[PDB]
Design a binder for this molecule. Structure first.
Ligand SMILES: Nc1ncnc2c1ncn2[C@@H]1O[C@H](COP(=O)(O)OP(=O)(O)NP(=O)(O)O)[C@@H](O)[C@H]1O
Ligand SMILES: Nc1ncnc2c1ncn2[C@@H]1O[C@H](COP(=O)(O)OP(=O)(O)NP(=O)(O)O)[C@@H](O)[C@H]1O
Ligand SMILES: Cc1ncc(C[n+]2csc(CCOP(=O)(O)OP(=O)(O)O)c2C)c(N)n1
Ligand SMILES: Cc1ncc(C[n+]2csc(CCOP(=O)(O)OP(=O)(O)O)c2C)c(N)n1
Ligand SMILES: [Mg+2]
Ligand SMILES: [Mg+2]
Lengths: 788, 788
């Protein structure tokens, strides 16, 4: 009897459906007189109309039917909204269920509450027109389109009984990120994870153009969505009387198959990739609004996308049509005199946490358990002498991540775009593997590292991975993202969205608990250009992240492996941040042992006393580095200067936290003027060697008292192919150019260092000539060790 | 007989195939002794191996077969390479055809030429490992994956007889941009445009993971690629003896269907969307290389992706295997004593421009005709009084673009992501329409503006549009891209690729002629937030573009419609640039008439004399603006100051060319120190009101003599929903905050302007309170006109 729809139940569901639309339209238009007790007048209409209408009925249409199966089958559901402009529909149902009144006591279920509820939407000092963090039961802001689908899969991970109902607009489906995220079924495990129920809201139109997926034939539509691995179900029509029964049956069909798929997998009898059920819903745009306006068809057309009538404040004719639109919902039989929904509506409202707007998963910070972090000092490489030993920088991190996975079998995951092996993080493969539910071959047994139980997820689409991870954190869990720095620009749009979400959730919204940080590891830099990656890779992603704020993002550039461990350990505890860690996978020198590394990361920036020779004296120059390749060149330059200028006093400063450079006025995390003057003196030149565009340092530290003595060398440009030393020479960040820069800046070396400066230019000439002759650097360059 | 393959022809084709692989492997490994006349020794091997091997045989496999049909059917073809790391294969065939020797006389077809040809690849001072602009017959650098498919469609536009053979790697297909660009068949007109022949190189593996599209079943593969609208053809196997004949038949089948499709369409008998032929090629990775290395299978596995044996310089065992690998191609029977290919190879080499590496389309700048630009002064709005009249800013540009389309029916196009109507550029719809070959309905007749003959292209995927336009320019044609500024971050990766391509083509490569500029119009700004677009939209894309260089990118922020016309007219003539024009679609004031606008854009920056009152005197303050909304606030602030401080002298400067602010030392285009001191004085405060992040101005103009007096107000952050004046108040760019800033900075107003400053803060309080009360600004704010 679950598939069939009772006429009595059909009426109550239809009653809820209209009330949701009525509240949606009221939010768009009304600022006063919520229930049409008195004739509508221009003083009740909002001056500026920013809400969108063409998608609201469809979202409410599915939402009331989703609540039906929750009441019947006791399903645990989440609502993820593709078109974020359909916010009123979600809020209306949130208010109808009673969630919004509990979270916001001002917007009660009364006439006075409705007045505040209607006036707040898309209003200065109110709430936005998208699925902002202020929305109860919301994890995804659909303002930027293409990421709703991935967030459904991310939230589904390690939530076996959860089902995430994600509604997808046909216009959104034309975007690149969402077209590739359909293949996420191959990495979702039916045994341990939940289900995603994709609903294609094929209203037939974008803002102003038809959607191609609507204008592509039905046969090719089913062909496209079986090739994605889904079992597609089609509900088409325009008359709700038929469509209420038809779509209730389809949703009943889908849930049984989802449970049948999960039952088959968890029993172990069918350990294969299943054909997940997906719904294709073709309904008119602006479904229950005006039919035509000024002789142009509006409903079921792109003209209904935002607002069918935007001149209602101007001419009374449309104003009467607006009031006629509202009364078509028959609000007199939907709400009582007080302003609450009628008891028929309250009957079909789910109860407590079973409500999709009050599910604690959406407010994932309440479901967040801190990771049991093993002591990273067990994985710290031994550094008996600083800078005299070479070890692979990322392998200790791989071993540390292995022990985190061991102690957090479900709460933690790894995400990587087919680069985990290249990034040299294979230590995690010792305990787990990579997720794969596609076809398997015996050749995968040797080094494939493929299993459905794996805690590491791999796909070449960077958009898919970022959406997977962001949803995983917002549901109250932990993760780590590792990728090349060359392709970081691909996810720049997605990072902005998540940073937006975190910043609002901290300051504006008070009831949303903190979630875990977004930890990103840019594992291959632009200085050590390996085989893969384009020639002109740029560090520009770092500038984009620092563009957001110091109170939501953190940038770390640890110089060695122990410093990488402390940074990763520190950032696996921080909550409301986007942590971007820039480290290189090549074999590098090691500088700090576990104790010294931990103290260095706690400060974020500090003097290296072994690399300095200014103890108990005023340094003639401060050499600072931020990165690992540029740190090596800065250290090598320091060695060269000390050989040729024995009396020269050099203070070596290494900075790991980029944002420490900002003054404490901007953010509390930054250094004070006294602290900054202690590290970098008030009047001596600073030769800063930065892994990135040099102006980023100037943007951060422009207000310091010694900024006029700050001289930053960083990434400028590249050739087609360069050796590691030649590439540093092109950007003037190599050891020889840095030594020249120190000679130019130190006042008592311009006259005295002329002969050394000529010798340094000779070395640049010799190494370039050898580079063009052999294709690599000299052995003494590659095997350079810290002297002294 | 075209379908069947002669055994004599099969041998010569196989002879070409092995020689191409041999040259490819020689480029990867050898730096000396090209032909194995003497035993291989470590001094002949390259020190560092950066080339990739797993894709080279597949590219050469298709390439030799593509040349077959050129010789038979006289087809005009282009080779677009998906995996850019497969550069050696393209270069080897380029050398084999003789193109490379003609372009590069140093690399002759001899033994001495081969020594230079082998030693140059992936070498310092040589050439890169990707499809850089130095490659003959190359339009697309496949280093960043996901854009090869779109570039095929872009180059195909308005080239009816051209066929673009684009080879697509299975790993690349997992990326977001390429998954959505498959639907580009719906916008390609068989009647007027050429064909794209997509070849899916499904080698089964990525760098280190299996490709899901390979591990998805064959049935679901055909289902996926018929849903994209393609007729898929499958060639599978590993034995070339069978695969040579099978593949040749499939390519023969595809070309006939492509011609049959074009013949049916151009006769007019079948004006429907056709099922384009697409090839799915499943071959082992590292197809003709080592079978196993160190007990691990390499060929047909991810272990062959880059280099099967990377220790050949270390141990002689692999060194013998490398020489055994080379001799498996039997080079003795492929090259003569001199070093040229044998006459059998020369027989099957195409001739002249029919060679894909020597096709003049790829060097599109030779095929570039300058647009016949109508005088924009016909579309200039009348401005009898500056700043006293309001007109829609983008509509005159739409009319101007309409006349360009009229005079350039084939050489020009418009690209937009479902925003042309929103951007208010509908004037172009008066002469043309939008491309659409999907299903048509009678409802589209009213305002659909849909026709297959349209010169405007629409799709919600911004990745697809950018790839379409870049290829269109690189083939020697013109275009204009219009989109919102909110979603500009989506195409940031693609823009970097094209900027990279232009910069190399100007300085490094000498034989590549200039092509047309990339003209981008960010038509909706972040200050006038309309219905669509997320709340926290940022101008950060401007910072990303200025990141590249002043010698390849230009940023224009015209204040009014006449400045927009002059800027667009000026930028439709420039060749080797990425032109980004930031304009707003809202109804705005108009400031300059056609004559004054043209002079202003010629300077790029200049004093507005009507808005100034410092003529013949030293100005107390310089108020500068860069944008249109911020220009209005700067002008309104100027009016407020002149009302309350009649003696105050204000010079108003408007800047359209952002890069003029850079000193002439960086680039010739920038202003000199004398010119800059003329506009902005040497010692007076400058209140700069910028449409964007304020630091961008400081990055550009830090070297100026008066930079210490430069005070920039720009975009900082947003609330959820704000009125236009309230949003400007939040960022302190409104008229009242600017007037306060002038009071603070002018030395003789700190004491004297205290009472006005208190009044200004009262206005800020009053307008915010009104905004929270009504939801819009006061009528006098919305209808503000320039006084005086
Ligand atoms: N005040 C500044 N504001 C912003 N960027 C700056 C500033 N000063 C320098 N830069 C940037 O820093 C880089 C080099 O300048 P800088 O770090 O000062 O080293 P420098 O050797 O002193 N160069 P210069 O200041 O011109 O003598 C360039 O990319 C500049 O754009
Ligand atoms: N010398 C500088 N180098 C780089 N960025 C700068 C510099 N001075 C200011 N900025 C940037 O400019 C913006 C605001 O400063 P600014 O444009 O100078 O206005 P302001 O009122 O003068 N603030 P202040 O300089 O601290 O008194 C921020 O993005 C700063 O990072
Ligand atoms: C890549 C991109 N291009 C354009 C937009 C502008 N935009 C915001 S909402 C929207 C409508 C989405 O279309 P559709 O999925 O059909 O939604 P619905 O009909 O449910 O409103 C568009 C185009 C965007 N957000 N992203
Ligand atoms: C989005 C993205 N992720 C990762 C890479 C790194 N990368 C460069 S080339 C390459 C191989 C592409 O795989 P496939 O299409 O299978 O190519 P082929 O087997 O022909 O080498 C990869 C993963 C990239 N360029 N872009
Ligand atoms: Mg739609
Ligand atoms: Mg592959």
């Amino acid at each position: 009897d679950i598939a069939t729809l009772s006429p009595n139940e059909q009426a109550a569901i239809d009653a809820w459906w209209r009330a949701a639309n009525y509240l949606s339209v009221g939010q768009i238009y009304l600022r006063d007189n919520p229930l049409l007790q008195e004739p509508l007048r221009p003083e009740h209409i909002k001056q500026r109309l920013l809400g969108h209408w063409g998608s609201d009925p469809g979202l409410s249409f599915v939402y009331v039917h989703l609540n039906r199966l929750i009441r019947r089958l006791d399903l645990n559901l989440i609502y993820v909204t593709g078109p974020g402009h359909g916010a009123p529909a979600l809020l209306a149902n949130a208010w109808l269920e009673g969630t919004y009144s509990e979270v916001y006591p001002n917007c009660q279920q009364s006439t006075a509450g409705l007045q505040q509820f209607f006036k707040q939407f898309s209003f200065p000092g109110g709430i936005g027109s998208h699925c902002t963090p202020e929305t109860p039961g919301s994890i995804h802001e659909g303002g930027e389109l293409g990421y709703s689908l991935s967030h459904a899969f991310g939230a589904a991970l390690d939530n076996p009984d959860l089902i995430v109902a994600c509604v997808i607009g046909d216009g959104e489906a034309e975007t690149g990120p969402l077209a590739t995220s359909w293949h996420s079924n191959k990495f979702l495990n039916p045994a341990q994870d939940g289900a995603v129920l994709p609903i294609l809201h094929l209203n037939g139109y974008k803002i102003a153009n038809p959607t191609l997926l609507s204008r592509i034939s039905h046969e090719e539509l089913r062909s496209l969505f079986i090739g994605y691995g889904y079992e597609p179900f089609f509900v088409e029509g325009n008359d709700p009387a038929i469509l209420h029964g038809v779509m209730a049956s389809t949703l009943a069909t889908c849930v049984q198959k989802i449970q049948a798929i999960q039952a088959a997998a968890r029993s172990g009898e069918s350990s294969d990739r299943p054909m997940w059920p997906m719904i294709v819903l073709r309904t008119p745009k602006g479904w229950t609004g005006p039919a035509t306006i000024k002789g142009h068809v509006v409903e079921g057309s792109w003209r209904s996308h935002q607002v069918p009538m935007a001149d209602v404040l101007t001419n009374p004719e449309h104003l009467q049509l607006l009031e006629d639109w509202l009364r078509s919902y028959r609000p007199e039989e939907l709400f009582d005199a007080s302003g609450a929904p009628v008891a028929e509506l309250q009957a079909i409202a789910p109860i407590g946490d079973r409500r999709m707007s009050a599910n604690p998963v959406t407010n994932g910070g309440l479901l967040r358990r801190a990771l049991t972090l093993p002591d990273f000092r067990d994985q710290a490489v031994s550094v008996p002498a600083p800078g005299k030993s070479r070890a692979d920088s990322t392998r200790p991190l791989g071993q540390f991540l292995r022990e985190v996975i061991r102690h957090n079998p479900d709460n933690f995951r790894l995400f990587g775009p087919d680069e985990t092996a290249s990034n040299r993080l294979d230590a995690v493969y010792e305990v787990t593997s990579k997720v794969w539910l596609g076809d398997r071959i015996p050749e995968d047994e040797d080094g494939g590292h493929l299993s459905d139980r794996g805690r590491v997820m791999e796909i070449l689409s960077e958009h898919t991975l970022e959406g997977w991870l962001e949803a995983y954190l917002l549901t109250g869990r932990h993760g780590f993202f590792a990728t090349y720095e060359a392709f970081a620009h691909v996810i720049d749009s997605m990072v902005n969205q998540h940073a937006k979400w975190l910043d609002v959730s901290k300051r504006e919204v008070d009831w949303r608990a903190p979630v875990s940080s977004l930890n990103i590891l840019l594992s291959s830099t632009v200085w050590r250009q390996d085989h893969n990656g384009f020639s002109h890779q740029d560090p520009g992603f770092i500038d984009l992240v620092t563009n957001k704020s110091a109170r939501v993002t953190r940038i770390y550039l640890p110089p060695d492996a122990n410093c990488l461990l402390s940074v990763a350990d520190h950032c696996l505890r921080s909550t409301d941040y986007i942590n971007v860690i820039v480290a290189d996978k090549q074999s590098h020198l090691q500088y700090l042992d576990a104790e010294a590394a931990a103290r260095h990361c706690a400060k974020g920036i500090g003097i290296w006393d072994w690399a300095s020779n200014d103890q108990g004296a005023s340094p003639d120059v401060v050499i600072a580095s931020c990165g690992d390749v540029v740190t090596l060149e800065a250290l090598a330059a320091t060695a060269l200067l000390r050989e040729h200028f024995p009396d020269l006093k050099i203070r070596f400063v290494n900075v790991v936290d980029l944002f420490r450079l900002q003054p404490d006025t901007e953010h509390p995390h930054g250094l004070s003027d006294r602290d900054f003057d202690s590290l970098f003196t008030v009047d001596k030149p600073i030769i800063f060697n930065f892994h990135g565009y040099p102006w980023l340092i100037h943007k951060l530290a422009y207000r310091r008292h010694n900024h006029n003595n700050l001289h930053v060398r960083g990434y400028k440009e590249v050739g087609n192919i360069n050796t590691p030393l030649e590439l540093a020479i092109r950007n003037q960040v190599d050891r020889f150019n840095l030594a020249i820069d120190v000679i130019d800046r130190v006042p008592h070396l311009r006259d005295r260092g002329a002969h050394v400066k000529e010798w340094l230019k000779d070395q640049i000439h010799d190494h370039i000539q050898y580079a063009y002759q052999e294709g690599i650097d000299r052995p003494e360059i590659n095997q350079w060790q810290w002297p002294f």
